[PDB]
């Protein structure tokens, strides 16, 4: 697996010779079975919103996240059979990431995917059998989360 640069718009080994490694944001540490565990997991900078219709949707907050940041592994239920994610396998074979249980996924479950290419500021691709989403441009405080599929990601699961 190699990492793109949203910089460049190109490939590296692990780090890009014009903006150094990739740069990953931690989610915030939260034992796993307890309740709301997938909101909790949210970085700091980064907001889990609620409503009382019962939907979320996710926002930056405090300060710009740069154009490049990395966010997760997306977590839960890995299976070979509204929140699933596939992953192609080493032997070529499909995988699907269910974050169905809030007490075992993180956040990115409530993450937007929005095929509308104006809102977008996050691509989802796979890196070592596990689902990431990259910041395609700077997100500003207040700004809300949406994510579509990256290009090598669609073509990946072409196969
Ligand atoms: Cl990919
Ligand atoms: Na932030
Ligand atoms: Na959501
Ligand atoms: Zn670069």
């Known amino acids: 697996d190699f990492w793109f640069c949203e910089s ?3 490939y590296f080994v692990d780090e890009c010779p014009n903006h150094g490694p990739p740069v990953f944001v931690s989610d915030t ?4 079975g307890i309740p709301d565990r997938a909101a909790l997991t949210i970085p700091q900078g980064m907001e889990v919103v609620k409503d009382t ?6 926002r930056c907050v405090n300060e710009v996240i740069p154009k490049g940041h990395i966010f997760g ?5 890995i299976s070979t059979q509204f929140f699933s994610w596939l992953i192609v396998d080493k032997n070529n074979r499909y995988k699907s990431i269910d974050g169905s249980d809030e007490t075992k996924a ?4 409530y993450v ?9 500021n996050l691509l989802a691709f796979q890196h070592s ?3 990431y989403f990259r910041a395609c441009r700077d997100i500003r405080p207040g700004e809300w989360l949406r994510v579509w599929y990256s290009e090598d990601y669609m073509k990946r699961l072409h196969s």
């Open 112 to 120: 937007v995917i929005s095929r509308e290419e104006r809102e977008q």
């Open 53 to 58: 219709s019962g939907e979320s949707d996710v």
């Open 8 to 10: 460049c718009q190109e």
């Open 129 to 131: 059998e596990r689902i």
């Open 73 to 77: 592994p997306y977590e839960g239920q």
């Open 106 to 109: 993180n956040w990115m479950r």
């Open 29 to 32: 540490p939260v034992p796993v």
